[PDB]
Coordinates of all heavy atoms in Angstrom, one line a residue:
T370 N 107.4 -89.4 -29.8 CA 107.5 -89.5 -28.3 C 106.1 -89.5 -27.7 O 106.1 -90.1 -26.6 CB 108.4 -88.2 -27.9 OG1 107.4 -87.1 -27.9 CG2 109.6 -88.0 -28.7
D371 N 105.1 -88.9 -28.2 CA 103.9 -88.9 -27.7 C 103.2 -90.3 -27.8 O 102.6 -90.9 -26.7 CB 102.8 -88.0 -28.5 CG 103.3 -86.6 -28.5 OD1 103.8 -86.2 -27.4 OD2 103.1 -85.8 -29.5
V372 N 103.5 -91.1 -28.8 CA 103.0 -92.5 -29.0 C 103.8 -93.3 -28.0 O 103.2 -94.3 -27.4 CB 103.4 -93.0 -30.4 CG1 103.0 -94.4 -30.4 CG2 102.4 -92.3 -31.3
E373 N 105.1 -93.1 -27.7 CA 105.8 -93.8 -26.9 C 105.3 -93.7 -25.4 O 105.2 -94.5 -24.7 CB 107.3 -93.4 -26.9 CG 108.0 -93.9 -28.1 CD 109.4 -93.2 -28.3 OE1 110.2 -93.0 -27.4 OE2 109.6 -92.7 -29.4
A374 N 105.0 -92.4 -25.0 CA 104.5 -92.0 -23.8 C 103.1 -92.9 -23.5 O 102.7 -93.2 -22.4 CB 104.4 -90.5 -23.6
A375 N 102.3 -92.9 -24.6 CA 101.0 -93.4 -24.5 C 101.1 -94.9 -24.3 O 100.4 -95.6 -23.6 CB 100.2 -93.1 -25.8
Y376 N 102.2 -95.5 -24.9 CA 102.4 -97.0 -24.8 C 103.0 -97.3 -23.4 O 102.4 -98.2 -22.7 CB 103.4 -97.5 -25.9 CG 103.7 -98.9 -25.7 CD1 102.8 -99.9 -26.0 CD2 104.9 -99.2 -25.4 CE1 103.1 -101.4 -25.9 CE2 105.3 -100.6 -25.2 CZ 104.4 -101.7 -25.4 OH 104.7 -103.0 -25.3
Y377 N 104.1 -96.7 -23.1 CA 104.8 -97.2 -21.9 C 104.0 -96.9 -20.5 O 104.2 -97.5 -19.5 CB 106.1 -96.3 -21.7 CG 107.2 -96.9 -22.5 CD1 107.8 -96.2 -23.7 CD2 107.8 -98.1 -22.2 CE1 108.8 -96.9 -24.3 CE2 108.8 -98.8 -22.9 CZ 109.3 -98.1 -24.0 OH 110.4 -98.7 -24.7
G378 N 103.0 -95.9 -20.7 CA 102.3 -95.7 -19.4 C 100.9 -96.3 -19.4 O 100.1 -95.9 -18.5
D379 N 100.6 -97.0 -20.3 CA 99.2 -97.7 -20.5 C 99.3 -99.2 -20.7 O 99.5 -99.7 -21.8 CB 98.5 -97.1 -21.7 CG 97.0 -97.2 -21.8 OD1 96.6 -98.5 -21.6 OD2 96.3 -96.2 -21.9
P380 N 99.2 -99.9 -19.6 CA 99.2 -101.4 -19.6 C 98.2 -101.9 -20.5 O 98.4 -103.1 -21.1 CB 99.0 -101.8 -18.1 CG 99.6 -100.7 -17.3 CD 99.1 -99.4 -18.1
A381 N 97.2 -101.3 -20.7 CA 96.1 -101.6 -21.6 C 96.5 -101.4 -23.1 O 95.8 -101.9 -24.0 CB 94.9 -100.7 -21.4
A382 N 97.6 -100.7 -23.4 CA 98.1 -100.5 -24.7 C 99.0 -101.7 -24.9 O 99.8 -102.1 -24.1 CB 98.9 -99.3 -24.8
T383 N 98.9 -102.4 -26.1 CA 99.8 -103.6 -26.4 C 100.7 -103.4 -27.7 O 101.2 -104.4 -28.1 CB 98.9 -104.7 -26.4 OG1 97.8 -104.6 -25.5 CG2 99.7 -106.0 -26.0
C384 N 100.7 -102.3 -28.2 CA 101.4 -102.1 -29.5 C 101.5 -100.7 -30.1 O 100.5 -99.9 -29.8 CB 100.8 -102.9 -30.6 SG 101.6 -102.8 -32.3
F385 N 102.6 -100.2 -30.5 CA 102.7 -98.8 -31.0 C 101.5 -98.7 -32.2 O 101.0 -97.7 -32.3 CB 104.0 -98.6 -31.6 CG 105.1 -98.1 -30.6 CD1 104.8 -98.0 -29.3 CD2 106.4 -97.9 -31.0 CE1 105.7 -97.6 -28.4 CE2 107.4 -97.4 -30.1 CZ 107.1 -97.3 -28.8
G386 N 101.5 -99.8 -33.0 CA 100.5 -99.8 -34.1 C 99.1 -99.6 -33.6 O 98.3 -98.9 -34.4
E387 N 98.6 -100.2 -32.5 CA 97.3 -100.1 -32.1 C 97.1 -98.7 -31.6 O 95.9 -98.2 -31.7 CB 97.1 -101.1 -30.9 CG 95.7 -101.0 -30.2 CD 95.5 -102.0 -29.1 OE1 96.1 -101.8 -28.0 OE2 94.7 -102.9 -29.3
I388 N 98.0 -98.1 -31.0 CA 97.8 -96.7 -30.5 C 97.8 -95.8 -31.7 O 96.7 -95.0 -31.6 CB 99.1 -96.3 -29.7 CG1 99.1 -97.2 -28.4 CG2 99.1 -94.8 -29.3 CD1 100.4 -97.0 -27.5
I389 N 98.6 -95.7 -32.6 CA 98.5 -94.9 -33.8 C 97.2 -95.1 -34.5 O 96.5 -94.2 -35.0 CB 99.7 -95.1 -34.7 CG1 101.0 -94.7 -34.1 CG2 99.5 -94.2 -36.0 CD1 102.3 -95.0 -34.8
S390 N 96.9 -96.3 -34.7 CA 95.7 -96.8 -35.5 C 94.3 -96.4 -35.0 O 93.3 -96.1 -35.7 CB 95.8 -98.3 -35.7 OG 96.8 -98.4 -36.7
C391 N 94.1 -96.5 -33.6 CA 92.7 -96.2 -33.1 C 92.6 -95.4 -31.8 O 91.5 -95.0 -31.5 CB 91.9 -97.5 -33.1 SG 92.4 -98.5 -31.7
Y392 N 93.7 -95.1 -31.1 CA 93.6 -94.3 -30.0 C 93.3 -92.8 -30.3 O 93.9 -92.1 -31.1 CB 95.0 -94.2 -29.2 CG 95.2 -95.5 -28.3 CD1 94.7 -96.7 -28.7 CD2 95.9 -95.3 -27.1 CE1 94.9 -97.8 -27.9 CE2 96.0 -96.5 -26.3 CZ 95.6 -97.7 -26.7 OH 95.8 -98.8 -25.8
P393 N 92.1 -92.3 -29.7 CA 91.6 -91.0 -30.0 C 92.7 -89.9 -29.6 O 92.7 -88.9 -30.2 CB 90.3 -90.9 -29.2 CG 90.6 -91.9 -28.0 CD 91.4 -93.0 -28.7
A394 N 93.3 -90.1 -28.5 CA 94.3 -89.1 -28.0 C 95.4 -88.7 -29.0 O 95.7 -87.7 -29.2 CB 95.0 -89.7 -26.7
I395 N 95.9 -89.8 -29.7 CA 97.0 -89.5 -30.7 C 96.4 -88.7 -31.8 O 97.2 -87.8 -32.3 CB 97.5 -90.9 -31.3 CG1 98.2 -91.6 -30.2 CG2 98.6 -90.5 -32.4 CD1 99.3 -91.0 -29.5
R396 N 95.2 -88.8 -32.2 CA 94.5 -88.0 -33.2 C 94.4 -86.7 -32.8 O 94.7 -85.6 -33.5 CB 93.2 -88.7 -33.5 CG 93.3 -90.0 -34.2 CD 92.0 -90.8 -34.4 NE 92.0 -92.0 -35.0 CZ 91.1 -92.8 -35.3 NH1 89.9 -92.6 -35.0 NH2 91.3 -94.0 -35.9
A397 N 93.9 -86.4 -31.5 CA 93.8 -85.1 -31.0 C 95.2 -84.3 -30.9 O 95.3 -83.1 -31.3 CB 93.1 -85.1 -29.7
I398 N 96.1 -85.1 -30.4 CA 97.4 -84.4 -30.2 C 98.1 -84.2 -31.6 O 98.7 -83.1 -31.8 CB 98.3 -85.4 -29.3 CG1 97.8 -85.5 -28.0 CG2 99.8 -84.9 -29.3 CD1 98.4 -86.6 -27.0
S399 N 97.9 -85.1 -32.5 CA 98.3 -84.8 -33.9 C 97.7 -83.6 -34.4 O 98.4 -82.8 -35.0 CB 98.1 -86.1 -34.7 OG 98.7 -87.2 -34.3
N400 N 96.4 -83.5 -34.4 CA 95.8 -82.4 -34.9 C 96.3 -81.1 -34.3 O 96.4 -80.1 -34.9 CB 94.2 -82.4 -34.6 CG 93.5 -83.2 -35.7 OD1 93.9 -84.4 -36.1 ND2 92.4 -82.7 -36.3
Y401 N 96.4 -81.1 -32.9 CA 96.9 -80.0 -32.2 C 98.4 -79.6 -32.7 O 98.5 -78.4 -33.1 CB 97.1 -80.3 -30.7 CG 98.1 -79.4 -30.0 CD1 97.8 -78.1 -29.7 CD2 99.4 -80.0 -29.7 CE1 98.8 -77.2 -29.3 CE2 100.4 -79.1 -29.2 CZ 100.0 -77.7 -29.0 OH 101.0 -76.9 -28.5
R402 N 99.3 -80.5 -32.8 CA 100.6 -80.1 -33.2 C 100.6 -79.6 -34.7 O 101.4 -78.7 -35.0 CB 101.6 -81.3 -33.0 CG 101.8 -81.6 -31.6 CD 103.2 -82.4 -31.4 NE 103.3 -83.0 -30.1 CZ 103.4 -82.3 -28.9 NH1 103.6 -81.1 -28.9 NH2 103.6 -83.0 -27.8
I403 N 99.6 -80.2 -35.5 CA 99.7 -79.6 -36.8 C 99.1 -78.2 -36.7 O 99.6 -77.4 -37.5 CB 98.6 -80.6 -37.6 CG1 99.3 -81.9 -38.0 CG2 98.2 -79.8 -39.0 CD1 98.4 -83.0 -38.6
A404 N 98.1 -78.0 -36.0 CA 97.5 -76.6 -35.9 C 98.4 -75.6 -35.3 O 98.4 -74.5 -35.8 CB 96.1 -76.8 -35.0
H405 N 99.1 -76.1 -34.3 CA 100.0 -75.2 -33.6 C 101.1 -74.6 -34.6 O 101.3 -73.4 -34.6 CB 100.7 -75.9 -32.5 CG 101.5 -75.0 -31.6 ND1 102.9 -75.2 -31.4 CD2 101.2 -74.0 -30.7 CE1 103.4 -74.2 -30.6 NE2 102.4 -73.4 -30.2
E406 N 101.7 -75.5 -35.4 CA 102.7 -75.1 -36.4 C 102.0 -74.1 -37.4 O 102.7 -73.1 -37.8 CB 103.2 -76.5 -37.1 CG 104.2 -76.2 -38.1 CD 105.5 -75.3 -37.6 OE1 105.9 -75.6 -36.4 OE2 105.9 -74.4 -38.3
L407 N 100.8 -74.4 -37.9 CA 100.1 -73.5 -38.8 C 99.9 -72.1 -38.1 O 100.0 -71.1 -38.7 CB 98.7 -74.1 -39.1 CG 98.6 -74.7 -40.5 CD1 99.7 -74.9 -41.3 CD2 97.7 -76.0 -40.4
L408 N 99.6 -72.1 -36.7 CA 99.5 -70.9 -36.0 C 100.8 -70.2 -36.0 O 100.9 -68.9 -36.2 CB 99.0 -71.1 -34.7 CG 98.8 -69.9 -33.8 CD1 97.6 -69.2 -34.3 CD2 98.5 -70.4 -32.3
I409 N 101.8 -70.9 -35.6 CA 103.2 -70.3 -35.5 C 103.6 -69.6 -36.9 O 104.2 -68.6 -36.9 CB 104.2 -71.4 -35.3 CG1 104.0 -71.9 -33.9 CG2 105.7 -70.8 -35.4 CD1 104.0 -70.8 -32.9
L410 N 103.2 -70.4 -38.0 CA 103.6 -69.7 -39.3 C 102.7 -68.5 -39.7 O 102.9 -67.9 -40.8 CB 103.3 -70.9 -40.4 CG 104.4 -72.0 -40.4 CD1 103.9 -73.0 -41.4 CD2 105.7 -71.3 -40.8
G411 N 101.7 -68.2 -38.8 CA 100.9 -67.1 -39.1 C 99.6 -67.4 -39.9 O 99.0 -66.4 -40.5
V412 N 99.1 -68.6 -40.0 CA 97.9 -68.9 -40.7 C 96.7 -68.6 -39.8 O 96.5 -69.4 -38.8 CB 97.9 -70.3 -41.2 CG1 96.5 -70.6 -42.0 CG2 99.1 -70.6 -42.1

């Protein structure tokens, strides 16, 4: 859903693939959701 939001609201975005592949935001958000889950689990 984050990738979809990044695409639909960014005219400069031209593909789901381009977003996942090099957009820095997706990387940060991915790291965040990964870290959050680990936090939730008590790590």
Side-chain angles (χ1 to χ4, degrees):
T370 70
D371 301 323
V372 172
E373 287 166 51
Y376 176 71
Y377 281 113
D379 196 306
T383 327
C384 179
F385 275 0
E387 175 178 68
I388 293 176
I389 296 173
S390 291
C391 71
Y392 275 38
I395 298 296
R396 291 173 180 180
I398 295 169
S399 294
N400 275 48
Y401 157 70
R402 295 202 191 288
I403 286 171
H405 189 241
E406 183 49 49
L407 249 18
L408 181 69
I409 293 306
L410 288 170
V412 180

